[PDB]
Amino acid sequence: LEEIAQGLEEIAKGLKKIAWGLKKIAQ
Amino acid sequence: GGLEEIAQGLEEIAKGLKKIAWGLKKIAQ
Amino acid sequence: GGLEEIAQGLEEIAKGLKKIAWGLKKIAQ
Amino acid sequence: GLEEIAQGLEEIAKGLKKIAWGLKKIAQG
Amino acid sequence: GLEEIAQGLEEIAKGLKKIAWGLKKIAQG
Amino acid sequence: GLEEIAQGLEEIAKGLKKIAWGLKKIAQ
Amino acid sequence: GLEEIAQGLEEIAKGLKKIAWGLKKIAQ
Amino acid sequence: GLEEIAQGLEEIAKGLKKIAWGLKKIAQG
């Protein structure tokens, strides 16, 4: 369960990076 | 560098999925 | 060109993987 | 939980279709 | 070759949508 | 809805073949 | 780079296939 | 079924990494 929580956190951080990357692409 | 950041984000998601896979594998005893 | 489409689609995929991940967590619990 | 997974799979499908469009454009220049 | 890959992704997308519909049906149970 | 899941798994396998052949084309 | 992206998407599809099959085996 | 889900997640992780490398290549020209 602890390792699942960490993985869900890493996924959120990655989605944020992708969001910022798409904004940079469109600007 | 927007493409580089999307790449890095995909790697971070990959790492996270692997950790979830490890957790589910433990649930399987 | 098509690079914008690919980047956009990869974000959708990533978002769908997040939902799948949380859905599995809810089932494991 | 199972419904969330399904919604995630549907979002992955949309993302794949967007990627398909990007490749199709690249294929045509 | 890009057109084939695009078509393949589109085909996987439809299969994922069909799988998704199936999970929602089981969820309703 | 087990029949729809089986059909989707088959659609994925079919799509997975088209990607393999497209990769081969690009490889050549 | 396009080749690598295609290969990765092929791998994702294969993994989603395994996930779907597992969920199916769980419901049954 | 839980093990197969974990294996599928791991395979997805591997595919995500390949996509990132392809994005890094395109970003470098």
Q: Tokens at residue D16, please?
A: 């794949």
* Cβ–Cβ below 8 Å for A6 and B24: no
Give the integer Cα–Cα distance in Å for D22 and G21. 29
Question: Pseudo-torsion of CA F18, H12, B8, D18, nearest 10°?
Answer: 40
Question: Pseudo-torsion of CA B2, B4, B6, B9, nearest 10°?
Answer: -140
Give the integer Cα–Cα distance in Å for G6 and F20. 9
Using a CB-CB cut-off of 8 Å, the residues of chain B touching C24 are: 20, 24
Q: Are G2 and H20 in contact (CB under 8 A)?
A: no
User: If you count DSSP H runs as helices and E runs as strands, how many of each does chain H have, helices first?
Assistant: 1, 0
Helix, strand, or coil (residue H24): helix
Among all chains, which residue has been given the structure tokens 């699942």?
Answer: A4
CB atoms within 10 A of CB B18: 21
Most D CBs within 10 A among E5, E7, E9, E21, hence the mutation to make, goes to E9
Query: F touches which chains (3+ CB pairs under 8 A)?
Result: E, G
